Design a binder for these strands. Structure first.
Ligand SMILES: [Mg+2]
Ligand SMILES: [Mg+2]
Ligand SMILES: [Mg+2]
Ligand SMILES: [Mg+2]
Ligand SMILES: [Mg+2]
Ligand SMILES: [Mg+2]
Ligand SMILES: [Mg+2]
Ligand SMILES: [Mg+2]
Ligand SMILES: [Mg+2]
Ligand SMILES: [Mg+2]
Ligand SMILES: [Mg+2]
Ligand SMILES: [Mg+2]
Ligand SMILES: [Mg+2]
Ligand SMILES: [Mg+2]
Ligand SMILES: [Mg+2]
Ligand SMILES: [Mg+2]
Ligand SMILES: [Mg+2]
Ligand SMILES: [Mg+2]
Ligand SMILES: [Mg+2]
Ligand SMILES: [Mg+2]
Ligand SMILES: [Mg+2]
Ligand SMILES: [Mg+2]
Ligand SMILES: [Mg+2]
Ligand SMILES: [Mg+2]
Ligand SMILES: [Mg+2]
Ligand SMILES: [Mg+2]
Ligand SMILES: [Mg+2]
Ligand SMILES: [Mg+2]
Ligand SMILES: [Mg+2]
Ligand SMILES: [Mg+2]
Ligand SMILES: [Mg+2]
Ligand SMILES: [Mg+2]
Ligand SMILES: [Mg+2]
Ligand SMILES: [Mg+2]
Ligand SMILES: [Mg+2]
Ligand SMILES: [Mg+2]
Lengths: 225, 208, 156
RNA sequence: GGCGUAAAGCGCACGCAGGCGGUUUGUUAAGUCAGAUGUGAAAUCCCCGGGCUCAACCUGGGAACUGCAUCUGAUACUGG
RNA sequence: AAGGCGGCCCCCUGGACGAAGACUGACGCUCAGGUGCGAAAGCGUGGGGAGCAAACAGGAUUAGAUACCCUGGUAGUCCACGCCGUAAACGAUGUCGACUUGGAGGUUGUGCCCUUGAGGCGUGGCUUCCGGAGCUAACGCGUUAAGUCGACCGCCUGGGGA
RNA sequence: CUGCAUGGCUGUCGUCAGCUCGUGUUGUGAAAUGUUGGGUUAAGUCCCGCAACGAGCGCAACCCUUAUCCUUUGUUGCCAG
């Protein structure tokens, strides 16, 4: 649904230098310009559309989707995409064991809810005001970390990651839990732990917004369908 | 040789004294001997009864013994039969007119003296101490205790090397002064020696 | 329906300022009476907690073994770190001729007729890893037929 | 089965005997492979049976004795 | 080749590598025994001898101090020719060949582009570090393998005794 | 008699700021992480970061006393008018 010169305009073909690249990306690199590899958008387009087709299958049948990017550049874009398709997001640090130790993270989901109940609706005025500020910065921290999954309740069914090494931990937890992985795999990453590899740049805000808007699209289209 | 007695340290804050009377120095130690002899007698008689706390109070030269027990049916018997049997010997010991009231112990699994005596009776009839400590903790945390710690000590399974063991479930803040820590201690006189049992139960903080 | 066997318990230690702290390790293996086998290794201050952690990890991380009727399919070898292990398919009702940890893992594996031999170190953890690797890489006539792109009858 | 550190690479090298040897064709048939014949004593072991009331035991037939020799062939491999 | 080799000049001399071609046509690899080389210390004969310095002497230190420290100081260290034939003689890793993802350098050639600068693109030899698969008891090795294989040789078989 | 058969109680390191667990992950494993790092504090005190997330005993506070004020009651206490 996205053409090659669309990707070339957003900056998907860019990548990293030739002293940081993974030799597993040899079947995805077109050439090398200015001592920088170039991502073959000829193989990017049909793989990104195969990923969006499987995304349209799962979000058609109301699978749970978790968007994972904490690059401090796609944090707002991955939030706006997960609130577009009312899916779940991780914009700040992936906690170690967020999926595997779900039964422990659940007790902080409940703590974030009870603190939100107490302060907005609960009007949890009338405490020791030093505790009212310790409750405030706890609830701010927990909403800043676990707010994107606070309505998820169970394990998600597919994980879409912007960078396979900035978020390599979530890859391992999904590989353990059998959850399929959709990922924007740059030249400096390992394409083995990812079930659906999408070559492309990772730091470009236009390309991250292109990827996320195309996923929040084929999910909203599969939900409405 | 380290820890203070949590009742005696909580006696001014959240715990009441088990004897609440007044006397001058002339009749103080005599009243306190009479209280000791009656707690001795009532414990020997109501040993099979799950008695926890004998509260003694004497207004106007008339002793009033309030027995807290988990079952009053075995302490009373028929209506004024065994209570009256114990009342006439209380009045014999104290030398004053007596009065016996019985306060029922709701939830006997949440009372340290009852748990410690159940463990002691189990160890006396030769059960595994770890099973007894498990059942005391599971029953207390089920019945709603915010935290229990049990501890046995010495000659466990007839071993010649005495060691101590302790279990803990929930939070038991001993240094928190407003914590309602029910603490008591029993002793099992086995054929291999004496096994000491301690039990702390934290129900929660009194916000006075 | 998943039969469960503990192989060996062991007391380990950890020396600290106060002295020696003892702990217990438990090596358990589970299986469904068929190719689904899985082992676990738990450790705690107490033996029932260690067996329960071991059975917990063993019930997951199960592995699938393409068995024959009740025996293996070809003479397979397995190694892990001290334990070269040979095992061989055998005739009907000759029993499980196997040593120590391998008897428990093949019994919950649902095999019934093997000829095994554990060379090298017979540490139960590494030899049960070597048997899991041998049964996992044992391959069927169907898998080799689809692999070579021929029929089973062309393979014989 | 091993040889960095647990026992174990000569201090290094040249090099005779010895071991091994790229690729193609032709030829040989030595090795090799197949078949046949002779032999490989009997007993023993094994198989199928028979006989002592059963068994041990005794025993019939067979297979086996994985070997060697000669001859007839084969020529991929190794050798010439 | 190892041991090892450090001002500069000359004489004699060995080896390596590169570029195009030309040529011989398997002439090759390894190697018991054997032969040769083989640090320092040491030995022999003949020289030489500044410094350093075993030994030794004196002074201190110390309970003692046949030591460390100090002041001296002889063989020796140096040269020629012989002998010895050993070292933690170590990469504690035998030689030869083949294949197997990468990255940053160092050194030494060489080809091409307009060298439009000391650049840009390659292609050989040697070498250092990190590290992937794989291997390994682990530590770690990791295209210069301790990975995957082939050929030949040497060696090991509990610690002492030895 | 046996404190070297024991309970209980007590000293001590030491009112030192430390000691651990659950699940998760790493390692064949003993174990590790957490509990480390950057700052900071009396303090494993707090903040940030982090394959850890949490929790417990302890670090603190809750107790008593002293230090200022207010209200109430003034004898056996007080004496400004
Ligand atoms: Mg004290
Ligand atoms: Mg594990
Ligand atoms: Mg062995
Ligand atoms: Mg060996
Ligand atoms: Mg050694
Ligand atoms: Mg050695
Ligand atoms: Mg060598
Ligand atoms: Mg040949
Ligand atoms: Mg021939
Ligand atoms: Mg022939
Ligand atoms: Mg023949
Ligand atoms: Mg014969
Ligand atoms: Mg017969
Ligand atoms: Mg020939
Ligand atoms: Mg020619
Ligand atoms: Mg030789
Ligand atoms: Mg010399
Ligand atoms: Mg000399
Ligand atoms: Mg001389
Ligand atoms: Mg001189
Ligand atoms: Mg000197
Ligand atoms: Mg030597
Ligand atoms: Mg060296
Ligand atoms: Mg050597
Ligand atoms: Mg040679
Ligand atoms: Mg390396
Ligand atoms: Mg090998
Ligand atoms: Mg090698
Ligand atoms: Mg090795
Ligand atoms: Mg003592
Ligand atoms: Mg004592
Ligand atoms: Mg843990
Ligand atoms: Mg610590
Ligand atoms: Mg720090
Ligand atoms: Mg704290
Ligand atoms: Mg305190």
């Amino acid at each position: 649904t996205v053409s090659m010169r669309d990707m070339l305009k957003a900056g998907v073909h860019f990548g990293h230098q030739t002293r940081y690249w993974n030799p597993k990306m040899k079947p995805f690199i077109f050439g090398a310009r200015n001592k920088v590899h170039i991502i073959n958008l000829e193989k990017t387009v049909p793989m990104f559309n195969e990923a969006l087709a499987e995304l349209n299958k799962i979000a058609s049948r109301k699978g749970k989707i978790l968007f994972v990017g904490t690059k401090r550049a796609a944090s707002e874009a991955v939030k706006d995409a997960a609130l577009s398709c009312d899916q779940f997001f991780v914009n700040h640090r992936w906690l170690g064991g967020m999926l595997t130790n779900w039964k422990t993270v659940r007790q902080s989901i409940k703590r974030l809810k009870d603190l939100e109940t107490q302060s907005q609706d609960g009007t949890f005025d009338k405490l020791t005001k030093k505790e009212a500020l310790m409750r405030t910065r706890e609830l701010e921290k927990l909403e800043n970390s676990l707010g994107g999954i606070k309505d998820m309740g169970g394990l998600p069914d597919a994980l879409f990651v912007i960078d396979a090494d900035h978020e390599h931990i979530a890859i391992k937890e999904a590989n353990n839990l059998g959850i399929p992985v959709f990922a924007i795999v740059d030249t400096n990453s390992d394409p083995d732990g990812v079930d659906f590899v999408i070559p492309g740049n990772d730091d470009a805000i236009r390309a991250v917004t292109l990827y996320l808007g195309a996923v929040a699209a084929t999910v909203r289209e599969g939900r409405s369908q | 040789g380290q820890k203070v007695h949590p009742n005696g340290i909580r006696l001014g804050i959240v715990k009441p004294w088990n004897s609440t009377w007044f006397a001058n120095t002339k009749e103080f130690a005599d009243n306190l001997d009479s209280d000791f002899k009656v707690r001795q007698y009532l414990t020997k008689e109501l040993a099979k009864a799950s008695v926890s706390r004998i509260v003694i109070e004497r207004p106007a030269k008339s002793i009033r013994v309030t027995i807290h027990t988990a079952r009053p049916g075995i302490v009373i018997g028929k209506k004024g039969e065994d209570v009256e049997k114990l009342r006439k010997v209380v009045a014999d010991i104290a030398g004053v007119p007596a009065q016996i009231n019985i306060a029922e112990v709701r939830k006997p699994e949440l009372d340290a003296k009852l748990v410690a005596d159940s463990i002691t009776s189990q160890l006396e009839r030769r059960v595994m101490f770890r099973r007894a400590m498990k059942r005391a903790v599971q029953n207390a945390m089920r019945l709603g205790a915010k935290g229990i710690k049990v501890e046995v000590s010495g000659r466990l399974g007839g071993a010649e090397i005495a060691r101590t063991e302790w279990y803990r479930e929930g939070r038991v803040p001993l240094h928190t002064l407003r914590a309602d820590i029910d603490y008591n201690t029993s002793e099992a006189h086995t054929t291999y020696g004496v096994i000491g049992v301690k039990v702390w139960i934290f129900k929660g903080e009194i916000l006075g | 329906e998943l039969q469960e066997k503990l192989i060996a318990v062991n007391r380990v230690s950890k020396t600290v300022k106060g002295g020696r702290i003892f702990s217990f390790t438990a090596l358990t293996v589970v299986g469904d009476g068929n190719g689904r086998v899985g082992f676990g290794y738990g450790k705690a201050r107490e033996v029932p907690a260690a067996i329960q952690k071991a059975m917990e990890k063993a019930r997951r991380n199960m592995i699938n073994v393409a068995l024959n009727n009740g025996t293996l399919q070809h003479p397979v070898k397995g190694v892990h770190t001290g334990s070269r292990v040979f095992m061989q398919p055998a005739s009907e009702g000759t029993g499980i001729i196997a040593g120590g940890a391998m008897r428990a893992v093949l019994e919950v594996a649902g095999v019934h007729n093997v000829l095994a031999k554990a060379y090298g170190s017979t540490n139960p953890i590494n030899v049960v890893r070597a048997t899991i690797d041998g049964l996992e890489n044992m391959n069927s006539p169907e898998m080799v037929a689809a692999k070579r792109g021929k029929s089973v009858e062309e393979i014989l």
